[PDB]
Design a protein around this ligand. Structure first.
Ligand SMILES: CCOc1ccc(C(C)=O)cc1NC(=O)c1cc(-c2cscn2)cc(-c2nn[nH]n2)c1
Length: 112
């Protein structure tokens, strides 16, 4: 049993850490809009989109029952981007930077 407001207090600093990465978090701060970005096949490749604003909303409204559901969503966001984008691309390398930041920040929090 984890109180959702206790989850938010424990977990939101790990999310604020990702938002602080500028410009690395900018591709991730809102859901990918495939028409606006001119990438119409995005939803064919990415079946379960995820982004920072969606995770933040789930945190703020108590949608996470347990800390691994949050980690699963953050990892999903990263895996989607690594899947869709080429290894040589700007978004892929920004994703790798965010994942580096996240792994450093989430590791002690999960120990709590
Ligand atoms: C052209 C390919 O773009 C992508 C491809 C793939 C993916 C993923 C997450 O797989 C992400 C993107 N890129 C974006 O989603 C994106 C969006 C906005 C945005 C949206 S609304 C006001 N701005 C700004 C920026 C941005 N990057 N640097 N500065 N701004 C980047």
């Amino acid at each position: 049993i984890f109180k959702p407001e206790e989850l938010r207090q424990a977990l939101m600093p790990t999310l604020e850490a990702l938002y602080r990465q500028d410009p690395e978090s900018l591709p991730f701060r809102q859901p990918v809009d495939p028409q606006l970005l001119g990438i119409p096949d995005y939803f064919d490749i990415v079946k379960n989109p995820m982004d920072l604003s969606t995770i933040k909303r789930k945190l703020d409204t108590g949608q996470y029952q347990e800390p691994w559901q949050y980690v699963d969503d953050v990892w999903l966001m990263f895996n989607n981007a690594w899947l869709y984008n080429r290894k040589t691309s700007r978004v892929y390398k920004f994703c790798s930077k965010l994942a580096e930041v996240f792994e450093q920040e989430i590791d002690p929090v999960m120990q709590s």
